[PDB]
Amino acid sequence: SGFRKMAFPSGKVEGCMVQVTCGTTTLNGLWLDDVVYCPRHVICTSEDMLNPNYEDLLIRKSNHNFLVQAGNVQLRVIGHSMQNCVLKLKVDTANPKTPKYKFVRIQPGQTFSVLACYNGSPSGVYQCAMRPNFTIKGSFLNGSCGSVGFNIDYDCVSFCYMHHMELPTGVHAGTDLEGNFYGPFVDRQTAQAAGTDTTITVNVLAWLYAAVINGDRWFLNRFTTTLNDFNLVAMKYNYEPLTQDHVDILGPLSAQTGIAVLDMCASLKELLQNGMNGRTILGSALLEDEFTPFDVVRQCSGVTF
Amino acid sequence: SGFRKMAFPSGKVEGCMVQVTCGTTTLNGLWLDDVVYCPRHVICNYEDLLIRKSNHNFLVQAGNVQLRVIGHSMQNCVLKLKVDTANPKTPKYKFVRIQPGQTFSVLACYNGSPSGVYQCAMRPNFTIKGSFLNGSCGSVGFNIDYDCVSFCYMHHMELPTGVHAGTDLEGNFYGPFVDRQTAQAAGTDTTITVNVLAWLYAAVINGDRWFLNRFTTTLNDFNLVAMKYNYEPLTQDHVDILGPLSAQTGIAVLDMCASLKELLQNGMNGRTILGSALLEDEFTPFDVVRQCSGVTF
Numbered sequence: 100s101g102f103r104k105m106a107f108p109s110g111k112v113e114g115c116m117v118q119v120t121c122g123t124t125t126l127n128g129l130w131l132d133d134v135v136y137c138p139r140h141v142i143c144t145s146e147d148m149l150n151p152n153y154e155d156l157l158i159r160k161s162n163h164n165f166l167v168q169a170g171n172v173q174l175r176v177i178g179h180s181m182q183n184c185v186l187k188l189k190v191d192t193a194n195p196k197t198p199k200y201k202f203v204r205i206q207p208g209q210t211f212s213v214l215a216c217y218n219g220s221p222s223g224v225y226q227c228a229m230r231p232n233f234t235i236k237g238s239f240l241n242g243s244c245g246s247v248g249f250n251i252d253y254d255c256v257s258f259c260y261m262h263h264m265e266l267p268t269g270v271h272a273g274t275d276l277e278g279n280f281y282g283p284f285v286d287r288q289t290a291q292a293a294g295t296d297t298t299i300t301v302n303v304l305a306w307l308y309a310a311v312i313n314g315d316r317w318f319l320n321r322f323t324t325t326l327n328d329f330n331l332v333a334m335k336y337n338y339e340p341l342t343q344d345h346v347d348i349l350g351p352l353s354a355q356t357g358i359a360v361l362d363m364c365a366s367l368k369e370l371l372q373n374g375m376n377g378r379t380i381l382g383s384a385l386l387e388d389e390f391t392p393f394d395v396v397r398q399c400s401g402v403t404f
Numbered sequence: 405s406g407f408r409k410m411a412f413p414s415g416k417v418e419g420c421m422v423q424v425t426c427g428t429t430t431l432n433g434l435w436l437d438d439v440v441y442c443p444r445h446v447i448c449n450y451e452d453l454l455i456r457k458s459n460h461n462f463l464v465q466a467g468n469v470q471l472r473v474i475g476h477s478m479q480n481c482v483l484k485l486k487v488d489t490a491n492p493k494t495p496k497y498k499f500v501r502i503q504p505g506q507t508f509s510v511l512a513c514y515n516g517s518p519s520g521v522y523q524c525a526m527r528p529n530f531t532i533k534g535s536f537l538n539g540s541c542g543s544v545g546f547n548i549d550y551d552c553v554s555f556c557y558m559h560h561m562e563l564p565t566g567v568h569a570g571t572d573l574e575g576n577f578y579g580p581f582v583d584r585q586t587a588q589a590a591g592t593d594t595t596i597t598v599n600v601l602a603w604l605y606a607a608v609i610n611g612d613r614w615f616l617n618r619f620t621t622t623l624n625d626f627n628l629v630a631m632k633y634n635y636e637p638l639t640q641d642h643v644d645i646l647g648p649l650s651a652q653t654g655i656a657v658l659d660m661c662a663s664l665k666e667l668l669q670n671g672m673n674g675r676t677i678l679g680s681a682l683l684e685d686e687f688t689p690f691d692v693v694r695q696c697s698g699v700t701f
């Protein structure tokens with residue numbers, strides 16, 4: 100029993116965090132085998148950021164300009180290349196703590212653990228989701244660039260995010276581990292703003308199924324809805340459209356509780372209309388959208404209360 | 405910017421988790437040096453049940469390697485299993501008993517394999533609102549101060565309301581609980597007042613000031629108000645502990661108390677604070693200072 104925002108154990112990722120310094124800038128890098136991955140803006144000054152020409156800034160650098168530190172040991176840089184917005188630093192020592200890993204690009208609505216680091220040293224771990232507007236509502240201070248987001252389903256670490264910047268609203272933007280940004284963002288100091296955000300509908304439904312699994316049914320009703328009528332209502336509350344893929348993905352949770360997806364959709368419509376009326380669902384007075392259908396199945400029991 | 409429920413990096417603790425089996429029961433153990441610590445209910449008078457067990461009855465598994473038990477003893481509600489191999493991944497550690505209101509990270513494990521990490525607080529009623537399933541017994545609670553892991557909790561049981569109960573690493577329970585199948589219930593809980601105030605300061609630091617007002621209060625007037633809403637009494641120690649956050653924001657502790665009094669009597673009125681429609685009490689003043697400063701381990 101119970102329902103918490105749960106992160107993956109961070110140990111496999113802690114053993115990969117290093118400090119990367121270039122000139123005056125210091126940020127974090129991910130050391131996997133003999134390569135250290137870090138944001139390419141490590142080669143920039145604050146002035147450069149307005150309109151940086153990364154190719155021009157990089158051609159002026161040599162291997163010995165990049166200082167890499169793993170614990171209290173200096174790593175020697177023997178090569179460098181740029182892949183999109185990530186800098187790949189070839190080092191002379193392979194990381195003996197390199198875990199089984201994959202680089203994965205996630206879609207909005209997906210969740211992951213973030214290991215926030217400063218000076219190549221881990222300070223905290225938290226769970227978050229890729230918002231529909233491609234930003235993340237993280238907790239980051241200056242020096243956190245290069246911190247990574249990951250999942251550890253089984254014993255393989257899937258790296259999905261690398262931190263690059265904070266937007267004016269306090270939200271965060273970054274890339275996958277191949278250097279491609281999530282969203283229409285650039286690693287440039289230009290007028291950039293997060294688009295209007297929406298609620299991840301399939302995630303709120305998953306969390307309502309988790310509440311039913313944990314014994315709470317107060318929010319259910321005798322009504323059903325068509326997928327189209329649900330979406331016409333959902334759009335009015337800034338909820339993402341629910342697709343037939345989302346309905347299929349919620350199938351197992353629907354079978355475990357005996358509540359059809361479109362009947363759970365009718366309950367969500369009613370909650371949006373009425374509010375909670377002094378009640379909570381899983382210790383929350385708001386509708387939670389940062390637990391996916393897969394996280395609910397992983398955390399919750401296979402036996403409904 | 406941003407304010408999240410943040411746990412300590414769990415790596416130093418992951419390297420200590422083992423699986424303990426005795427008869428039909430399988431739960432988790434904490435392997436530090438040549439001793440494995442686990443709940444004494446794995447053997448289920450515990451001395452009479454224990455005297456009937458031999459070293460070879462306890463099967464300990466560290467990864468895919470079987471550890472050999474060479475001795476056993478009981479300390480309160482924890483079983484200490486002496487093993488022939490010292491854990492090479494043993495970190496610098498202390499066993500600490502925490503007070504209600506204090507927070508810690510829990511590394512939830514099943515079959516000696518860590519599956520998740522989350523942050524939580526020791527409630528005033530000595531229970532924890534955790535997330536555990538059958539097989540989670542032996543999962544531990546910890547804090548990290550510099551390079552030293554402070555183990556403060558070991559999971560033993562789930563109460564009928566879905567809340568959790570356990571011991572410190574010396575086997576002493578938090579709360580009036582016993583490790584047996586008997587009618588046990590969590591007492592009425594209260595809100596950790598010093599923690600809600602710390603979280604209000606964290607909201608101000610992150611640019612949320614709508615709840616601030618021109619008013620101040622006395623500790624005595626506020627404590628009458630707090631007692632009416634099932635909030636823990638605020639002591640002068642709590643006021644002193646909130647000093648740094650008060651200086652950083654320019655909001656006196658009793659100035660922030662008048663804001664909390666207004667939120668308690670009037671509600672939020674369709675507004676949220678740090679993305680929450682409820683007043684959050686699971687961030688201590690030290691947690692707020694640490695997250696809004698970037699302390700590393």
Ligand SMILES: O=C(Cc1cccc(Cl)c1)Nc1cnc2ccccn12
Pocket residue numbers: 140148239240241242243244263264265266285286287288405
């Ligand atoms: O935003 C930047 C620098 C920067 C400026 C413009 C573009 C790029 Cl790619 C990077 N650093 C940063 C990351 N996260 C935080 C949190 C707080 C303060 C600063 N943070």
Ligand SMILES: O=C(Cc1cccc(Cl)c1)Nc1cnc2ccccn12
Pocket residue numbers: 100445536537538539540541560561562563582583584585586
């Ligand atoms: O509570 C017990 C069994 C038990 C019975 C009587 C005494 C003692 Cl100490 C333990 N196990 C348990 C722990 N956490 C959970 C979560 C869910 C279900 C079961 N859980």
Ligand SMILES: [Cl-]
Pocket residue numbers: 204205206209
């Ligand atoms: Cl995805």
